[PDB]
Amino acid sequence: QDLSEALKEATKEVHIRAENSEFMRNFQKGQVSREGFKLVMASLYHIYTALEEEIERNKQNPVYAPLYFPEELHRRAALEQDMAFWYGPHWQEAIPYTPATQHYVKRLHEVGGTHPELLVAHAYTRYLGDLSGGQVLKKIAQKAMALPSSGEGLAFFTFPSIDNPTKFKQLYRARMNTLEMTPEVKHRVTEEAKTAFLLNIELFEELQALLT
Numbered sequence: 001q002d003l004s005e006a007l008k009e010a011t012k013e014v015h016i017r018a019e020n021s022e023f024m025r026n027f028q029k030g031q032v033s034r035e036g037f038k039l040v041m042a043s044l045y046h047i048y049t050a051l052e053e054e055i056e057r058n059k060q061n062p063v064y065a066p067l068y069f070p071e072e073l074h075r076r077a078a079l080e081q082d083m084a085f086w087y088g089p090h091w092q093e094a095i096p097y098t099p100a101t102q103h104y105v106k107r108l109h110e111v112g113g114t115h116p117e118l119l120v121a122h123a124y125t126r127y128l129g130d131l132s133g134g135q136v137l138k139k140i141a142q143k144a145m146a147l148p149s150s151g152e153g154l155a156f157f158t159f160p161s162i163d164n165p166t167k168f169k170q171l172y173r174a175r176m177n178t179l180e181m182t183p184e185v186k187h188r189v190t191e192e193a194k195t196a197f198l199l200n201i202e203l204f205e206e207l208q209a210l211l212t
């Protein structure tokens, strides 16, 4: 069984749970506000910054190298533009760094620095979602908050270096399936992917509480 398929099957359950968190449920209904949107995007800024810092650290490591697509996938630059859009010229000192976000970042660094063979679980969880359902969330946000089709404020959800997300996704999956795999690695990667989903749900639960 290919890793790409093992991951999808192993996280399809927790994915349903994540979609139904209070925050994401409200979001889907289009009840997402500027204050709430800012909290999640600021948090993603920190998360992707940590994720990509670890990706760079392990770019030449075989347990991750085949998935090294900075130009097409990396989000930090886009999130920096979004931060300037939502928080202003001095966003760096204005954006929040919540406990749940810190917790996520902590695990990302543990994985990247100590268990790099599991980094793929975290890139899969975030990037493949962005390339698929993330496009749906993008439309919802635009409609809800009157964001321009030109893209301002939603750079995170825009991949200008990729013609077709569905095509790249298939490529990314194929490359994921070239990683040297053993029962040991496959089992732990799928487990870490479930943990990654949980970290996201915990972030969403925290943000909703901060909002209510």
Ligand code: HEM
Pocket (backbone or CB within 6 Å): 004, 007, 008, 015, 018, 019, 020, 024, 025, 028, 124, 125, 126, 127, 128, 129, 130, 132, 133, 134, 136, 137, 197, 200
């Ligand atoms: C309520 C918000 C969400 C919606 C509406 C949503 C919806 C979707 C949709 C429509 C797909 C494509 C289904 C398919 O190809 O069969 C997808 C895939 C995916 N989503 Fe989400 N999603 C949401 C939340 C999340 C969250 C919170 C994560 C974890 C950070 C996530 C990660 C993924 C991943 C990793 C995939 C790719 C699965 C695969 O093809 O292997 N999604 N999502």
